[PDB]
Write an enzyme that holds these catalytic residues in place. Structure first.
Site: not given
Ligand SMILES: COc1nc(NCCc2c[nH]c3ccccc23)nc(Nc2ccc3[nH]ncc3c2)n1
Length: 291
Positions: A33-34, A37, A99, A142, A160
């Site tokens: 949505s934002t 990545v 990562f 979230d 997230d």
């Protein structure tokens, strides 16, 4: 106009300059949505990081962009995906992160069925993260399998934080409709003042995920789904008969409609179900390269 003010203000909370000098080989890994990545290499070390790129002119709730880059700055926990830096880059916000080579828990709950020893390993991991965060008034908001990332060797890290939130002795609650619909706490959907408890419910929904492979009402549209989360008694497991009373008893403490009564992460760390939790080597066989 409101864009340049917003831009100037965000400048002050990120790290100065341009990370493109030292980052090479962007490899897209995900979309949200934002925004997107990527992974990248740091030229000076050879090391891999993950970079989230969030377009400033393409958000719903633009001002949410302030949260993570401040709240999570220099936050250090073994069950939290560390955030290294943020920067302003063009009309974009980039967050540079650890990562996690194993992918998200999503892949695993969609393609297989986790045993209880693995479900408790994930639950311990996440609750060890949640208690330290809540004892400082940070609310993830979230929680779902997408935010659970893995190492090659099966260690679990919460990720997230884009929708996260900070509460205080003076603003002890939030009121904002954020999260992912089918995961949202009854009160949250309701538009009432809420605390860290909204995370516990959400984790309950994630347990349904690990058991059932999907959350409740996943088929029904998000709008109507949300409604049913507010209007109905807690959802049960489709595969109830597949689970121990240890697991069910443990679930019965997260899916409580009244947040006052709902267990807290601190409470949940003492629950017998978690004695089941396997070493992080019990997770390895669930991962894609190892299936
Ligand atoms: C909201 O959409 C979205 N999608 C994805 N993709 C996850 C895939 C992934 C996570 N780790 C991976 C390793 C190899 C291939 C894929 C992965 N990742 C994220 N966020 C994210 C945040 C921190 C991270 N650290 N390492 C990866 C990573 C991904 N967000």
């Amino acid at each position: 106009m409101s864009h340049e003010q917003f831009r100037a203000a965000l400048q002050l909370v990120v790290d100065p300059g341009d990370p493109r000098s030292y980052l090479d080989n962007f490899i897209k890994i995900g979309e949200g949505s934002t925004g997107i990545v990527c992974i990248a290499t740091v030229r000076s070390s050879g090391k891999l990081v993950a970079v989230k790129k969030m377009d400033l002119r393409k958000q719903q709730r633009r001002e949410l962009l302030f949260n993570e880059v401040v709240i999570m700055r220099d936050y250090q926990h073994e069950n939290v995906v560390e955030m290294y830096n943020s920067y302003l880059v063009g009309d974009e916000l980039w967050v540079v992160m650890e990562f996690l080579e194993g992918g998200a828990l999503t892949d695993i709950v969609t393609h297989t069925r986790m045993n209880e020893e693995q479900i408790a390993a994930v639950c311990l991991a996440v609750l060890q993260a949640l208690s330290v965060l809540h004892a400082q008034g940070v609310i993830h908001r979230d929680i779902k399998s997408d935010s659970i990332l893995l190492t090659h060797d099966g260690r679990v890290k919460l990720s997230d934080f884009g929708f996260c939130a900070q509460v205080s002795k003076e603003v002890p609650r939030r009121k904002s409709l954020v999260g992912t619909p089918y995961w949202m706490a009854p009160e949250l959907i309701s538009r009432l003042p809420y605390g860290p408890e909204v995370d516990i419910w959400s984790l309950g929904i994630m347990v349904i995920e690990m058991v059932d492979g999907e959350p409740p009402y996943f088929n029904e549209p998000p709008l109507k789904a949300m409604k049913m989360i507010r209007d109905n008694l807690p959802p049960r497991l489709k595969n109830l008969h597949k689970v121990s009373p240890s697991l069910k008893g443990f679930l019965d403490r997260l899916l409580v409609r009244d947040p006052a009564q709902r267990a807290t992460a601190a409470e949940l760390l003492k629950h017998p179900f978690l004695a089941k939790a396997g070493p992080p080597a019990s997770i390895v066989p669930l991962m894609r390269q190892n299936r």
